[PDB]
């Protein structure tokens, strides 16, 4: 019933990664946790990309999917995103309470 446990573990594993990672020399988008996915250090003008977060209740059904977020040509993250691959396979229906909780984690 409580899968908030996995989201906080996912975030601090990302924070641990940022505390034990040498950043790339040059211009790159900083690795961070946007409360949805853990993003690695990404070169500029490059569509960053990681697997679907494993805190999702439907993670295994999309364990092979990926999240997308375009890094700008300046080291800052752009607005362009794509979480469609990691979405709920059957969107509206059950999973309300977490679809609802995840909607707050935006």
């Amino acid at each position: 019933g409580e899968l908030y446990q996995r989201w906080e573990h996912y975030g601090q594993e990302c924070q641990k990664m940022l505390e034990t990672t040498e950043p790339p020399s040059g211009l790159a988008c900083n690795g961070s946790f946007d409360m949805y996915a853990c993003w690695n250090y990404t070169a500029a003008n490059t569509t960053a990309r990681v697997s679907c977060p494993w805190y999702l209740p439907w993670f295994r059904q999309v364990s092979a999917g990926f999240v997308f977020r375009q890094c700008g040509s300046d080291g800052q993250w752009g607005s362009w995103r794509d979480h469609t691959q990691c979405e709920n396979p059957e969107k509206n229906g059950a999973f309300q309470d977490q679809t609802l909780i995840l909607e707050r984690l935006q």
Partner: antibody
Framework: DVQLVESGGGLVQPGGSRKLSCAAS????????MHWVRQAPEKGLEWVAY????????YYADTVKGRFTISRDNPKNTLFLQMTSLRSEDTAMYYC???????????WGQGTLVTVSA | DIVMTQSPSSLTVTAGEKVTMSCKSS????????????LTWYQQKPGQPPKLLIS???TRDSGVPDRFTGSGSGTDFTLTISSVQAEDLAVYYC?????????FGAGTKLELKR
């Protein structure tokens, strides 16, 4: 090459204070969390304290909390460890350590010896 | 606090032989999320600082030879050193890297027979 050089060790009177320093080089010091790990003479390793790159996350071992204080100076690439109320069981080789994903502790310094004796 | 128990505490081999040493944790070190085991193996030669050997139970660091191999999951872990050289004379520590406080084991001291 990743390099961590500790200093400040030596003889300390019982109950006295002593501040250790750790000079870092070969990496971006302001992006890494830092550790202090001790080892009593011919004993095992004992983790002491941890502080994040931004100094917003600080942990201490139970046998040290309240007496020791870990801090850093990122513009000077220096790790600090302030000891207070030292006893003989604090006699140990003190290492500062950096991590490398996926582990918290990867690179060790040469260590500086601290002896608590009258 | 997570307790680490290494066995055997002492060990004597001739040069060039396969050796195995155990390391058990009082609680599980496997994070069911990424399915990683947060165990770290260290090597400490006499008079020297500890050196990183294995991260995440089985991942060798850069420069570590193929002779050192970590394995296991959950609470039981093993470090295998095939073809032990005379330079492998050291104390081998396994460390809990799962949660704070980070705890080490008593260490398996590798001694050599000639």
């Amino acid at each position: 090459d990743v390099q961590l050089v500790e200093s400040g060790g030596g003889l300390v009177q019982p109950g006295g204070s002593r501040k250790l320093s750790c000079a870092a080089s070969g990496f971006t010091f302001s992006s890494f969390g830092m550790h202090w790990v001790r080892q009593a003479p011919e004993k095992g390793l004992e983790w002491v304290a941890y502080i994040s790159s931004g100094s917003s996350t600080i942990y201490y071992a139970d046998t040290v909390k309240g007496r020791f204080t870990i801090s850093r100076d990122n513009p000077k690439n220096t790790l600090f460890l302030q000891m207070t109320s030292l006893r003989s069981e604090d006699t140990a080789m003190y290492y500062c350590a950096r991590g490398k994903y996926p582990t918290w502790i990867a690179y060790w310094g040469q260590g500086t010896l601290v002896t608590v004796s009258a | 606090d997570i307790v680490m128990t290494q066995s055997p505490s002492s060990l004597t081999v001739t040069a060039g032989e396969k050796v195995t040493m155990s390391c058990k944790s009082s609680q599980s070190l496997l994070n069911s999320g990424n399915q990683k085991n947060y165990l770290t193996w260290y090597q400490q030669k006499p008079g020297q600082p500890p050196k990183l050997l294995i991260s995440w139970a089985s991942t060798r660091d850069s420069g570590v030879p193929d002779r050192f191999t970590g394995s296991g999951s959950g609470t039981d872990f093993t470090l295998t050193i095939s073809s032990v050289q005379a330079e492998d004379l050291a104390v081998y520590y396994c460390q809990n890297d799962y949660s704070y406080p980070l705890t080490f084991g008593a260490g398996t001291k590798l001694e050599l027979k000639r």
